[PDB]
Assembly symmetry: D2
Homo-oligomer: 343 residues x 4
């Protein structure tokens, strides 16, 4: 081997360790285009901590050639995953017509029983295994071409205990309708690649792109750690430049992303130095404020960059709230995180 | 020398030649950080056709060291510009407090007379030279920190014949308020770099970024050609992934950006092949349509890439209007170009 | 979503320069991608032809990938066609050294090459009139100290079972093979032998490219490619090196540079030299008239115009501007010699 | 908006590796950027120290850039300080060959080096106790055929006016200078001699870096740097090459690689070799026990862990895994020799 890892530099919330996970992907054992061990190589290289090779149960177009059961791609990844310190969550993709559409069952013990005639029996087996289940690409236009709706089956599934999360972001597809669903129904927001091609084929790493993924705030770096995080919705989806999650999580995360220090002060205002200590670009937009409190209208804090920020005091003011939205920290559809720097 | 040019691959409107211009930049002869010939090297390399080194009249912080008049940086660029086939428009930046703020006077014959005590006399000299004049960075938060307004002086200036355009985009600053101004007041939409640093220092070319600039649709590649285009508002600002301009210009431009061909048809629908023949990424978003006409919800046509697009016919339909907004072809603030592919 | 990155290199007079990769693997042997991926990659890299050459003898996925020796090729035909990629059927005869490993291309059937005796694997290929070349002769796993030519190789060569040698494979450069081809009248080949996804082995961010072969053909067809290979109308493109016989490399260089006299006086000449290609060209001054003053070394970056001055000392009025194109290998440790006569 | 790209290279025991560029220009001579830009660039490139060394004799912008010889340095002090960049005052004595061009650094005043006789320019620098080195000895504009050592150079050297030679300048590599330093007990230096904006001459997209000097110091201070230069505790970092005396390069390599024995049996040993640096390392097998079977050639990419197997043939139980670190130049055309004893 020739092993190189590019760590994903993001912080940890107090009490938790931030794990980078991809809970949805494919190999040639379904409709994917790579041998399963490649998914392990890619995760390693990309600084991921955990993955789930979630083959389609119902869709295996290579089956005349690639002859196996539903547990086989997982089996093939185990040694590699161990050697490279990647956590491997057994899972599968229950692929059906809309509704209910496509769901992933992860933390399975056995994939085979998920092959059933009736979709309902498919979900009953996964449930029986106590699987963590989430709705995939609700918004995929192939199944919902005009509008991303919630069907009576999703309601059923959700009441049966067969929906624990929803993908709010899949590959290059962002689905805000799902954000509101997770908020209203108390579900875990998920983000995955749903990779079929080689990873490099779908992400222009050259341009600093990254695979859509999920930040999991775990009490420990183990299978159980991840599961407990997911059970408790202690996640955020990382998509392009967006980070999607509950405010109660994004707020403290943002606080860890920047190092704000008062460099100076006087009668005329305050001088700060704000440093982005992450790999994540941060985009700030001024919000309602005291007009006598003079600062930026817009501001982009690039990764690992320190900025000098002057806040002016007009008329007589001695301080105040430097208010802004972190536009790319999505706490609700079309709503970015609100933050204040009190001076 | 060692000369390499990276052409900007965009089309030409019928009757016109598309020229790529930067009408606002700086050298060490004001507050810029490079020798003037560098601006010529950069333009060449970046596939530009024309530039204007527009030094501040009032602000020259290097003056103890760099001793000259206001025509000198232009003078120094002439030979290089000629050798490299770059068109050099003499200009300057009338730098004042808000209001009226900062304006560029281009197509000057002599920069020196623009140095006057009263700003009004500054504009009267530029006018006297029949200069093409535009308002710079109306939105720059340093001078308008809370809101981008139109002052009574801009009204005056505009009625005196001292405003022919407005920058709708400056460097990494997008100012939509200006779009509406140009639309209401019939002005030329401009986009510039306002470069002070070396060009590579402010644009991550690695990530395929490009200097903010202006597409000028000229009847000829000459100084007069450009001037006639500008006089007639035959421009579009190119900013990041956005192209900003009047619909009557963007519509036919988009039509030249894609090559749509019907690959096939039947009772079930139509198969198209759409190719982006430009360096510009194109972003399509489905709009109001016949629901029986099944197609994408969202779609990104990357540069120089061919896509196969299937349009389905539900119930009995034999065709219709494949409607979508080109979200990054801005025809009005917050309003993208509307387009239809009739089948 | 299809995007092609054309390889901008010139055409010699009377021929079309085809970019080909005659050695590669998929899951159907010991590669790591579905076969259709090799066609996609080829299209994207601006290639014209490929051969998916699965090992006959080494199929470590066969318990899962149950198909025969013809299957990966079969699975690529449609795609190749849709994307304009010529698909040459081949296989890799994979044995112990000697003879080592050989590619057999322009096959009609891969299945019969599965034989107990290596010589029978070769007779089957020969019976199909295959174009056969010796792979990675220098691979350290089989020749760990010296790249040697073995009796088995003489014999295969004498039996009409060696038409080419790989001079470059992946990231491995094997000069010993250059001399062999030169001495034996064989086709120098450059291939990738890709097993990983292509992007995993080549850093395209850095201007790297798959090792490949420039094939100078009379037509963009399977038949056109074969006639070129049969007659050694090839060059191996490896990293920054272009490797081939001098009678090809010389006119090729000529086509890579646009030289113009911009000016002349008593003091010398000013030339403009433009590199109209994607290839970097490295020049180094060789023996010359010392009164003819020019560069010592010079690198011509792709698609870049250079202004070059030649001084005339004492009373000289002209002369031979002599240099070596160091990355244009015409023989082991020998670059193309060239003159600009002024 | 400040972003620093640290150069990740190791520290030798007892010293701190400083990255320095002792040769560069601005608009105050024949460079093309305002001086403050050189400080910004240095910070961004992960450098620790620079010297803006304007030509004394060649100031083609002086009709516009009217200031004295101390001014560009002066203009950079504040910025340098704000950004933690050590600023060494210097100038370039720019003459015809011989003696050619020399940098004088650790100056107190640049103004007095402006003299009619070159020897007086040097006496002024020497009077200030400057560290003096010969620039681009191999520059083809002044030595177009051969890089020669001239009597003027012997004389400057004997007069205590040559403490170093540039072995690497910008994109120019000059091996002749390596032997000279070795023979004369001088400091090998690598500089950029940047005139353009830095990005214009280096393709960072491709992993290129400014030519520079690794300085092994006892403190991150002007005084620390000087003591290092005085005692030749340097290496020149040029493209993929690191050039320096063997007594520095050997422990430096040792620090670049983390070697571990992962396993051993009768059949051999499996090692893991990690390159913990930003530097690419190129290994080539040298003379060895032929019963000790290992790689022929191997390239260790930055921040990459390699699994390497050493086979034991016949009855061998261990041995010397001998190779050359080809990009670690200890002498002209000589790479660092190294052994891993198993
Ligand atoms: C994006 As799929 C074919 O895994 O549903
Ligand atoms: C952005 As300016 C200092 O040219 O107004
Ligand atoms: C490099 As191979 C396994 O094709 O001999
Ligand atoms: C390369 As120079 C003009 O500093 O001698
Ligand atoms: Zn799938
Ligand atoms: Zn799915
Ligand atoms: Zn899927
Ligand atoms: Zn300015
Ligand atoms: Zn301004
Ligand atoms: Zn300006
Ligand atoms: Zn193989
Ligand atoms: Zn092989
Ligand atoms: Zn092979
Ligand atoms: Zn110079
Ligand atoms: Zn010099
Ligand atoms: Zn110099």
């Amino acid at each position: 081997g020739a092993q190189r890892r590019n760590e994903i530099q993001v912080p940890d919330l107090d009490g938790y360790t931030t794990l980078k996970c991809d809970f949805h992907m494919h190999s040639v054992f379904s409709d994917g285009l790579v041998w399963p061990t490649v998914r392990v190589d890619e995760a390693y290289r990309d600084g991921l901590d955990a993955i789930s090779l979630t083959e389609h149960i119902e869709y295996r177009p290579h089956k005349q050639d690639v002859v196996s059961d539903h547990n086989r791609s997982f089996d093939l990844c185990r040694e590699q995953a161990e050697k490279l310190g990647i956590l491997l969550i057994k899972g599968s993709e229950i692929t059906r017509a809309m509704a209910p559409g496509h769901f992933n069952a992860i933390f399975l013990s056995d994939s085979n029983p998920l092959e059933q005639k009736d979709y309902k029996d498919a979900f009953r087996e996964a449930k029986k295994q106590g699987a963590f289940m989430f709705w995939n690409h609700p918004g995929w236009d192939s199944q919902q071409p005009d509008t991303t709706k919630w069907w009576p089956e999703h309601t059923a599934l959700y009441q049966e205990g067969c929906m624990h999360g929803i993908e709010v972001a899949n590959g290059h597809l962002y689905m805000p309708e799902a954000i509101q669903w997770c908020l209203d129904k108390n579900l875990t927001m998920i983000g995955t690649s749903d990779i079929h091609q080689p990873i490099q084929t779908d992400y222009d790493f050259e341009k600093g792109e990254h695979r859509t993924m999920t930040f999991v705030f775990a009490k420990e770096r183990s299978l159980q750690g991840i599961r407990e995080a997911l059970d408790n919705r202690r996640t955020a989806a990382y998509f392009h430049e967006l980070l999607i999650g509950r405010e109660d999580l994004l707020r403290p995360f943002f606080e860890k992303c920047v190092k704000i220090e008062e460099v100076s002060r006087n009668e005329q205002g305050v001088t700060l130095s704000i440093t982005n200590v992450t790999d994540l670009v941060l985009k700030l937009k001024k919000t309602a404020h005291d007009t006598l409190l003079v600062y930026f209208r817009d501001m982009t804090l690039k990764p690992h960059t320190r900025y000098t920020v002057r806040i002016g005091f007009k008329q007589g003011i001695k301080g105040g709230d430097v208010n802004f939205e972190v536009t790319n920290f999505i706490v609700a559809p079309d709503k970015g995180l609100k933050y204040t720097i009190s001076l």
